[PDB]
Backbone:
């Protein structure tokens, strides 16, 4: 007769192909990629013959076999594919096999194959849209927003996006390489911690805790391998296979390292670390480059050279070559994008008409045209067109788009930007014809998290009543609120200005729309982005 039925012994059932040290602070100690997970299973048999051969089955498929020499036993074997498996121990002899009841074992991999879909309900004013317009609908999620801003991956209205970019992957480097970071309390030190023992110019994760260790919805178990933002993004990909999730390298405070890449040795190292990063974190679909300005004029006043333009094009070409190489190894398709200044002065420092051949999308930062960083020359921070009181306005969305088109950039590459925040001044005075923008400010308006900047959510919630004047400039296609008594002036994007941008995109056959940091929207902005571009509603 066949062998008795074995019982699976108590023991850990959670394994990982890519192991993460939930206690590590240094990126070099944080993750280790393996070609497969080392799984172990033990069993006992109290009634019946132990058979002559023991086998481990995963979903009915043999994954191990060996001599069944005793009433109890242990099997060690490898699993090279992530997922949740129904595991069984089978004892066999001439008369047949007898399998134990199934025990679930989890083999984690960074593509999220071991995680159930993260399909959360829409929050606040967000309404469901189908991505059927064929246009890009993107937004940026910030890594550091999970603390005080309390905005986690589960709060992202993911179904309403085609592209989701991640709030800045930094580039390792200390004094003289990331000085711009020193302006943020403890930020430079945090990077040095992440980059402990890591070569300069290789990428890393600025906050390993927030990215992989902090408990979040869906990845809360004390022993889950991947938690934090990355763990949730993996589950998000399971829920939205077609959503493009891209890591964004750079930003205003992390762009300093880019100015040294004219040196191919450093550029090669950077590119090489990006490939390794992508091989390690499978849920990402490519890479976004946010070099805050080839030519300088970014956060660091001591950086910038006429050579940056060429470096940028070379970088994009090499990243593309690296990604093609990656495609040949994994068979997957990867995207290469870049967020760029919308000012003509900076746009002409780069040959985008050339770089565009290596890129999938160009995210035009058509915002920050004006702000508290300038108290004398005020204006619409993210308008589509110039205002009536100053038709010669240089910084507008249209001028940015025209500058690129003039270089020869194909329209379908250009994704227009919308702001989910407003910039503002205080003590505005000396203006004429009741146009606050004609005067000067005495300082920045009180912000939500920093001076001169307010979340759109707060604007709609607090500055749409009381003493606040509201005006929608139909010429520039830009709204603004003004509080006469204190001289508080705020320029931002609203449902209507976003609609104008969307229509503009459709008319000029541009690529789509994207917004800066999803955490600041109450839903009005993203709803309008989708609607204006023609995406259907429904559920
Ligand atoms: C990494 C870091 O230093 N974080 C800081 C944080 O700085 C932020 C804010 O100043 C962002 N501003 C707004 C209006 O949200 C700022 O955003 C920039 C961004 O860098 C540019 N790059 C893009 N892309 C499309 C990729 O868009 C723009 C936006 C709009 O100007 O980014 C910096 C970091 O570069 O500031 C907080 C305090 O507010 C600080 O705690 C820390 O988290």
Residues:
């Amino acid at each position: 007769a066949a062998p008795g039925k074995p019982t699976i012994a108590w023991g850990n059932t959670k394994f990982a192909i890519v192991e993460v040290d939930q206690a590590a602070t240094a990126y070099n100690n944080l993750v280790k990629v393996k070609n497969a997970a080392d799984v172990s299973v033990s069993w006992n048999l109290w009634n019946g013959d132990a058979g002559t051969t023991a086998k481990i089955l995963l979903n009915g498929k043999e994954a191990w076999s060996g001599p069944s020499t005793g009433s109890s036993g242990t099997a060690n074997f490898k699993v090279n594919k992530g997922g949740r498996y129904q595991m069984q121990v089978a004892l066999c002899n001439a008369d047949g096999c007898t399998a134990s009841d199934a025990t679930e074992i989890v083999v984690a991999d960074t593509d999220g194959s071991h995680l159930p879909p993260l399909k959360e309900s829409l929050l606040e004013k967000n309404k469901p849209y189908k991505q059927n317009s064929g246009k890009v609908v993107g937004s940026y999620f910030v890594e550091a927003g999970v603390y005080g801003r309390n905005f986690t991956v589960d709060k992202i209205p993911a179904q309403n996006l085609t592209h989701l970019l991640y709030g800045f992957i930094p580039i390792c480097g200390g004094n003289g390489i990331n000085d711009s970071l020193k302006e943020i309390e403890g930020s430079f030190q945090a990077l040095q911690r992440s980059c402990q023992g890591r070569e300069d110019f290789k990428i890393s994760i600025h906050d390993p805790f927030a990215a992989l260790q902090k408990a979040q919805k869906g990845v809360t178990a004390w022993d889950d391998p991947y938690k934090g933002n990355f763990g949730q993004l993996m589950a998000l990909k399971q829920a939205h296979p077609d959503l493009k999730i891209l890591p964004s390298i750079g930003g205003w405070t992390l762009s300093d390292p880019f100015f040294f890449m004219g040196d191919k040795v450093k550029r090669d190292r950077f590119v090489g670390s990006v490939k390794e990063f992508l091989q390690t974190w499978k849920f990402f679909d490519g890479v976004d480059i946010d070099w805050e300005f080839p030519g300088g004029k970014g956060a660091n006043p001591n950086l910038g050279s006429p050579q940056d333009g060429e470096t940028y094009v070379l970088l994009m070409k090499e990243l593309r070559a690296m990604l093609d190489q990656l495609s040949a190894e994994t068979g997957r398709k990867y995207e290469l994008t870049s967020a760029i200044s919308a000012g003509k002065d900076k746009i002409d420092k780069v040959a985008y008409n050339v770089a565009q051949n290596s890129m999938d999308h160009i995210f035009l930062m058509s915002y920050d045209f004006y702000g508290a960083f300038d108290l004398k020359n005020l204006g619409h921070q993210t308008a589509l067109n110039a205002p009536a009181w100053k038709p010669d306005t240089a910084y507008t969305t249209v001028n940015g788009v025209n500058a690129l088109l003039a270089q020869g950039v194909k329209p379908g590459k250009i994704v227009v930007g919308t702001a989910m925040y407003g910039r503002g001044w205080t003590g505005v005075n000396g203006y004429q014809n009741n146009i606050p923008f004609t005067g000067t400010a005495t300082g920045p308006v009180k912000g939500t998290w920093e001076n001169g900047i307010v979340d759109y959510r707060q604007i709609a919630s607090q500055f749409m009543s009381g003493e606040w004047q509201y005006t929608y400039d139909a010429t520039a296609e830009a709204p603004y609120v003004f509080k006469p008594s204190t001289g508080d002036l705020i320029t931002f994007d609203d449902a209507r200005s976003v609609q104008a941008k969307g229509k503009y995109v459709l008319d000029k056959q541009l690529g789509g729309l994207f917004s800066w940091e999803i955490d600041a929207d109450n839903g009005d902005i993203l709803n309008s982005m989708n609607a204006s571009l023609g995406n259907s509603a429904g559920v």
Summary: Residues 140, 144, 168, 184, 187, 248, 251-253, 290, 339, 363, 365, 368, 421, 449-450, 453, 516-517 surround ligand 1 (CB under 6 Å).
